Structures are given as structure tokens and as C-alpha cells.
RNA sequence: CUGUAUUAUAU
């Protein structure tokens, strides 16, 4: 039984011959073509392996669809393994296919079929440049599928590769925001506690929450940390660290075109977020209800605060609108007068009516009487200005919300 | 006379 060392034949001019194509826009090798850009029916996966042409198919639309179609699913099939080997044998080739507009779709197909063994090498390849892959419009789709399908220790290793990176620039990126959200919504909190430490800084939190994309990152993190079933307070301490920055900067965030949505989320949530709801109303909304109610963005925040606040805070909000402001020196107009005829404030006055109408069904008699007293104050001002309000769509809806009402 | 986001890849 003499030994045989079988070295591989050097085929050093095969990429050179796969670079010949009919079209200059397509990469399909001419030998696989039918002349019309499609894959000739004589072609087999063994032909792609024999000619070392995996990249050139993967970078072509129809050749990549051919790869996705015929790739065996089972991990013990020999063609599966030889293709997987061609994919992963060179790290730079692998990462370039991940960043391609067409080849990424083959990489995802491999992940759909992968077992733990294949996932280890895929994870080792991806970790070497995870940050820039998250920024790429093609590769981020691979990273998100990897977060979904990988065993959690592998997905954790990859997620931890983002620690100490430029997470503002990544969180606000049109591609990377979805990678951060997929991590936060999918993986255990221990895999991304570094993201909560990053957002503890006020400047990072502000720069991210006031962004069309970053506000989604902050909101998905709050949703995950607030949903609970626990005996100690780990997610409690993490949530507390994040919410402190939101509460410290909620006056600016509530009036922002993007961050207003997460402030409303904190207020509508209740339960684990209820204490933070109360802080926002007391330290940001109060003393500012009139100005915020005339703003395009913050007027939605004031609506949800009237909708969801506990009675003790609804009372301070009500008392500010009816009694909190010095009437205008020229017009003698108070806050309710302004909001009744304002294009944004009319919506706040409508929530105030709805809140009071539903609060009349409250068990405590004093509360029911107090909600009725506020409705009577609104009814009176509306009557004094009905001749004008009935001409607007807002005033018609206000008058209809106050009809057939037994206040006490 | 009605009032705000994002919800992203196949030349």
C-alpha cells in the first residue's frame, strides 16, 4: 500500500478566459451563454466547478439565478460541498460576492442551507469587515440573514464585532439601521449591551434619534428592553440608562420631525415605560402645552399625552390650558381661544374632549365631576365662537363631539 | 380646514 500525494493542477489562466463575455454589462462566461444572456441548457454545476467560474456566474443576474436554483440543499451532497469550498476558499472573493448586487443572493441561499460547520467559516469571513459590510446595500442583506439563521454564539461574535465602532454613522445609514434593528430585535440583550452603553451618551442619542433612520433604531431598542417575567433588574438597568438620556433631552426630541414618534411610543406604551411617561409630561410638556400644540410635530405628542396620561397629570395639563397663561395684551385671547382656531391645535382640543368624555365613565365620582367641568369650559368657549367654527371642518367635528351630552 | 417619519437590494 504505497502512498500517493496528489497535488492539484495549476490552472493559472482560467479567470482570464472566463472574462470573455458577449455583453459588456453582463459577466456570464460566453461558454455558458445561449447568445441571449441566458444559461445554455447543456451547462451543469459540474461545468461551473470544472471551469472555476463560480464568481462569473454569481456576478451575473441569470447565472446567479441558475446557482440559486440548482444548489443542492443537503449538506452531505458533494456538489454542495465543492461549491461551498469555491465560495469560502478565498476571503476577498467571498466578501466581494457579498457586496455584489447579484452575488449576495447566492450567499443568502448558502446561509439558508448551512449547518453549524459551514456557519463557522462564514462567520469568520464576515467578522473581518462586518462594519463596512453593514454599510453596503447588498451585504447588509447578508448580515441580516446571518443574524437570523446563525447559531446564537456565532451571531453574538459577529454582533460584538461592532463594539467600539462609529455607531452614529452606522445607526443613521439607510442600510445599516436595519442591521442594528435586526440585532436588537433578534439576539439576546447580552450580545448588544454595548449599543445601550453607546446611546447612554446624550450627544450620540440626540444625533441618532433626530434622524429618519436612527429614530427607528432607538425605538426598536426601547421596545425590546421594555417588553418583559424577570426577578432581577438587568434589562431594567439597561432601559433606565437609555431612558435617562431621552428624559434629559425630551423637550428637544418632542418637537423634532423624527424623534416625536419615539416620544409618543414612550407615552402610549404604559407598563414598563409608564414612569418615564410621567417624567416627560412633568419636565417637558408642562409649561409648554400652548407652544407645542401649535407645532406640526409636537402637537401629536400633546395629543397622545392627553390620551394616555394618568388623571393626576391630565389635571395639571387641563389646568395649564384653562388657567396657565397670561391673555394676549392686544386680543385678550387665552390658550383655548388660540387652539380652537389653530390648524394644529384644533386636534389637541378634540383629544381633550375625547379624554373628558371617556373619563366621565371613571369610577371615582370626583374625577367624573372634574372631567365634566372641563367639558363645560370647552362647551362654553365653543358656543361663544360657534358662528365661525361651524364654517371649518375642525369646528364641525368639535361641535359634533360635544352633542347630546349629560356632563353630570 | 383640516395636520408629521422610516418600513431599504435582481444590471
What angle, 0 to 180 degrees and rounded to 10, lies between the N-to-C axes of helices A214-226 and A234-248?
A: 140
CA distance A178 to A182: 6
Q: Å from A63 (CA) to B4 (C1')?
A: 45
Q: Give the nucleotide with minimal C1' distance to the Cα of A108.
A: B9
The method of structure determination was: X-ray
**Alpha carbons A45 and A28: distance in angstroms, whole number:** 14
Nucleotide nearest A297, CA–C1', reads: B4
Q: How far in angstroms lies nucleotide B7's C1' from the CA of residue A213?
A: 10
* CB distance A275 to A239 below 8 Å: no
Closest CA to B4 C1' — which residue?
A297
Closest CA to A314 of A284, A355, A353: A355
- DSSP letters of A317-357? HHHHHHHSSPPPTTT---HHHHHHT-TTHHHHHHHHHHHHH
SS3 of A116, please?
Answer: helix
Q: What is the DSSP string of A40-87?
A: PTT--HHHHHHTT-HHHHHTSHHHHHHHHHH----TT-HHHHHHHHHH
**Cα–Cα dist A239/A254, whole Å:** 19
State how far the Cα of A87 lies from the Cα of A122, in Å rounded to an integer.
Answer: 10
Please name the nucleotide lying closest to A65, CA to C1'.
B10
What cell was used for A169? 454613522
Tell me A271's DSSP state: G
Which nucleotide is closest, CA of A395 to its C1'?
A: B1
Contacts of A207 (CB under 8 A, 6+ apart): A168, A172, A214
Q: CA-CA distance, A187 to A221, in Å (whole number)?
A: 12
Cα A145 to Cα A281: distance, rounded to the nearest angstrom: 40
Identify, with chain letter, the residue nearest to nucleotide B3 (CA–C1').
A344
Residue A325: how many other CB atoms lie within 10 Å: 16
C-alpha cell at A191: 450580545
Cα dihedral across residues A170, A173, A174, A177: positive or negative? positive
Amino acid at each position: 500500500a504505497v502512498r500517493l500525494i496528489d497535488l492539484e493542477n495549476n490552472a493559472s489562466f482560467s479567470k482570464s478566459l472566463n472574462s470573455t463575455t458577449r455583453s459588456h454589462k453582463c459577466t456570464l462566461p460566453i461558454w455558458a451563454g445561449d447568445g441571449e444572456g441566458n444559461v445554455s441548457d447543456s451547462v451543469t454545476l459540474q461545468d461551473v466547478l470544472a471551469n472555476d467560474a463560480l464568481v462569473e456566474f454569481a456576478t451575473d443576474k441569470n447565472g446567479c439565478r441558475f446557482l440559486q436554483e440548482h444548489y443542492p440543499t443537503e449538506n452531505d451532497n458533494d456538489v454542495h460541498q465543492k461549491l461551498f469550498r469555491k465560495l469560502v476558499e478565498d476571503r476577498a472573493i467571498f466578501l466581494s460576492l457579498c457586496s455584489n448586487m447579484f452575488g449576495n443572493f447566492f450567499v443568502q441561499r448558502v446561509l439558508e442551507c448551512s449547518n453549524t460547520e459551514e456557519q463557522e467559516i462564514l462567520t469568520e469571513h464576515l467578522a473581518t469587515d462586518l462594519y463596512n459590510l453593514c454599510l453596503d446595500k447588498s451585504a447588509c442583506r447578508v448580515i441580516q440573514l446571518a443574524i437570523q439563521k446563525l447559531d446564537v454564539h456565532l451571531a453574538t461574535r459577529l454582533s460584538l464585532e461592532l463594539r467600539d465602532t462609529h455607531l452614529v454613522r452606522l445607526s443613521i445609514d439607510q442600510n445599516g439601521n436595519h442591521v442594528i434593528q435586526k440585532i436588537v430585535k433578534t439576539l439576546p440583550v447580552s450580545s448588544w449591551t454595548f449599543l445601550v452603553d453607546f446611546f447612554a451618551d446624550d450627544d450620540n442619542l440626540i444625533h441618532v434619534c433626530q434622524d429618519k433612520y436612527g429614530c427607528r433604531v432607538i425605538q426598536s431598542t426601547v421596545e425590546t428592553l421594555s417588553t418583559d417575567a424577570q426577578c432581577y433588574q438587568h434589562r431594567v438597568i439597561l432601559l433606565r440608562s437609555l431612558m435617562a438620556g431621552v428624559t434629559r433631552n425630551c423637550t428637544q426630541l418632542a418637537s423634532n420631525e423624527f424623534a416625536n414618534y419615539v416620544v409618543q411610543h414612550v407615552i402610549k406604551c404604559g407598563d414598563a415605560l409608564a414612569v418615564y411617561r410621567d417624567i416627560i409630561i412633568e419636565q417637558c410638556l408642562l409649561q409648554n402645552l400652548l407652544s407645542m400644540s401649535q407645532e406640526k410635530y409636537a402637537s401629536h405628542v400633546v395629543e397622545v399625552a392627553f390620551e394616555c396620561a394618568p388623571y393626576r397629570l391630565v389635571a395639571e395639563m387641563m389646568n395649564e390650558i384653562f388657567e396657565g397663561y397670561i391673555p394676549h395684551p392686544d386680543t385678550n385671547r387665552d390658550a383655548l381661544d388660540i387652539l380652537l382656531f389653530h390648524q394644529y391645535g384644533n386636534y389637541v382640543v378634540q383629544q381633550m374632549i375625547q379624554t373628558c368624555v371617556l373619563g366621565q365613565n371613571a369610577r371615582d365620582q370626583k374625577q367624573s365631576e372634574m372631567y365634566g367641568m372641563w367639558l363645560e369650559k370647552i362647551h362654553g368657549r365653543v358656543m361663544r365662537n360657534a358662528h365661525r367654527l361651524e364654517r371649518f371642518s375642525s369646528g364641525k367635528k368639535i361641535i359634533e363631539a360635544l352633542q347630546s351630552m349629560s356632563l353630570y
